[PDB]
Structure 1
């Protein structure tokens, strides 16, 4: 929900009757879950032996898989998939049911969640992933655009980065909307930008060193002209095509089926196991977090 933008210059006479106002309803969002899975298979013979630097081949392989699933999770929540699903306009399902895809079976397609990019003010799609070549829309009440395509006109075409000034433009958009974002998650390959704020054509807070035995060349904290103090964080599993401006409290992990133990059939010297868990992603407001894409310069 959001207040009305009918501020204008409302002026009323003294002796009139109360005229009907302009009321607008809320807006409902909806995201689907995704199924993660990691299978394990080890012959009984190998599981019976005693490896020279570990225990059984089953638990060791299970632990390796139990960690890979978490890595796959962090990479998907931070991806830009477009919530691939078959249903459409069936969330307020109260007047009837959806028998369009009811006479089907496991042949159904694979469901996908709405990643960071899809849940924000995305301007378009690319089949299954958010399109970065399009500038996102603006909020109805405010005029903020939390999805901005970096110009990079300051830097040349040799180095790409995203920009040095476009980082401050997002803080303006967030403040314009009222978001409380205080974290800037970035890929490690782009940290040289936030630390390498130089190359501004001889200006704009360049550099100096007082001939000291300490060379840092790092930037972790940031403050915008408005006063919003931001803290930069690095994530190895983040993509190298966008930057995220968000807040921890404005995100939540929706877990439907938690990872549990699943012993399957054998069929003869197989000893098959499996890991599986269904998880989704939520966002309190698409305009409560920023996404700064990356593009070339002039």
Structure 2
């Protein structure tokens, strides 16, 4: 959860007389894993053996679907919320009929990054996150493009630097930023302006490089930019290698049902700490 606060003054008068300490131990967080099937059903110029072709095609499709889901705004929903164990009950009305099957839904990226709500099963894209007690930091904020009168849907010039400030205050150390190609034009034009304080130059150069792949906030935190087409257009992410890990239970297996071909991949999402990674929604306030 966090370290203890500062509390400011800690003067004393030569005596402890404590109250069993204010430890307030950590909170226990969990996540669920889902299933992906992508069934194959077979019922001839060059393809020949279409089985392996369709199998590899479906494998690539399931990989794309995983890349699309893990970066979505889903929220884990299941009969169990915080008493996952319930070894006593654990859905007693399950054996004998075996038809009480519920749908395992895992936690997504925007859900674990210190969210501040969720529209039923999706993270709300118009509400900033709370503050961590260790140090005041809001790692999830609603973007406010103060350059246009709420007409253009784009990052402000100083809206990512605010995220860098918040992360530095919380101590995330992230250095990567994924972005949908529908927003790279913003960072591209950021190297220029209209006021006349930023402009390119070409000293007899046969090149027109129009691209940005590195940022350094005034705090001295570098940030490498990478583009990914499988992200939602109305969002941007602040990733980090170690802070995110991909938990897997059942590896992709080519097999068949009980006595066709199919795939089944059990996977879940894990995040070291919510206030480490950062998310930023792009819209106009209303």
Q: Shift of the alpha carbon at 1:166?
A: 0.6
User: 1:95 and 1:8, CA in 2 relative to 1: closer, same or farther beyond 3 A?
Assistant: farther
2:144 corresponds in structure 1 to: 151
Q: Shift of the alpha carbon at 1:102?
A: 7.0
1:3-35 residue CA offsets vs partner (Å, 9 max, x unmatched): 111431110123666664322111111100010
Greater Cα offset, 113-122 or 192-201 = 192-201
User: 1:170 and 1:82, CA in 2 relative to 1: closer, same or farther beyond 3 A?
Assistant: same
1:48 corresponds in structure 2 to: none
Q: Shift of the alpha carbon at 1:210?
A: 4.3
- d(CA) in 2 for partners of 1:4 and 1:103? 50
1:134-192 residue CA offsets vs partner (Å, 9 max, x unmatched): 11111121111111110012134443113221110000110010111110111111111
Q: Shift of the alpha carbon at 1:213?
A: 2.1
- d(CA) in 2 for partners of 1:291 and 1:93? 34
Q: Shift of the alpha carbon at 1:251?
A: 0.6
- d(CA) in 2 for partners of 1:110 and 1:19? 46
User: 1:56 and 1:88, CA in 2 relative to 1: closer, same or farther beyond 3 A?
Assistant: same
User: 1:189 and 1:106, CA in 2 relative to 1: closer, same or farther beyond 3 A?
Assistant: farther
Q: Structure 2 stretches of 5 or more lacking a match? A: none
Q: TM-score if structure 2 supplies the norm length?
A: 0.91
Q: Shift of the alpha carbon at 1:84?
A: 2.5
1:103-136 residue CA offsets vs partner (Å, 9 max, x unmatched): 8744533221111000111111111100011111
User: 1:184 and 1:16, CA in 2 relative to 1: closer, same or farther beyond 3 A?
Assistant: closer
- d(CA) in 2 for partners of 1:288 and 1:83? 20
Three-state SS of the structure 2 residue aligned to 1:194 is helix
- d(CA) in 1 for partners of 2:218 and 2:171? 15
1:265-292 residue CA offsets vs partner (Å, 9 max, x unmatched): 79xxxxx111111100000000010001
1:204-240 residue CA offsets vs partner (Å, 9 max, x unmatched): 6454444632111111000001000000011111111
User: 1:202 and 1:109, CA in 2 relative to 1: closer, same or farther beyond 3 A?
Assistant: farther
Contact 2:127 2:142 in 1 (8 A): yes
Contact 1:156 1:297 in 2 (8 A): no
- d(CA) in 2 for partners of 1:243 and 1:203? 28
2:22 corresponds in structure 1 to: 22
User: 1:243 and 1:273, CA in 2 relative to 1: closer, same or farther beyond 3 A?
Assistant: same
Q: Structure 1 stretches of 5 or more lacking a match? A: 44-50, 267-271
Contact 1:154 1:200 in 2 (8 A): no
1:32-88 residue CA offsets vs partner (Å, 9 max, x unmatched): 001011111111xxxxxxx32223121111111011000000000000011122222
Greater Cα offset, 202-211 or 189-198 = 202-211
Backbone CA RMSD of aligned residues: 2.5
User: 1:94 and 1:42, CA in 2 relative to 1: closer, same or farther beyond 3 A?
Assistant: closer
User: 1:92 and 1:12, CA in 2 relative to 1: closer, same or farther beyond 3 A?
Assistant: farther
Three-state SS of the structure 2 residue aligned to 1:184 is strand
Match of 2:52 among 42, 59, 62: 59
User: 1:12 and 1:276, CA in 2 relative to 1: closer, same or farther beyond 3 A?
Assistant: same
User: 1:17 and 1:41, CA in 2 relative to 1: closer, same or farther beyond 3 A?
Assistant: closer
Greater Cα offset, 243-252 or 156-165 = 156-165
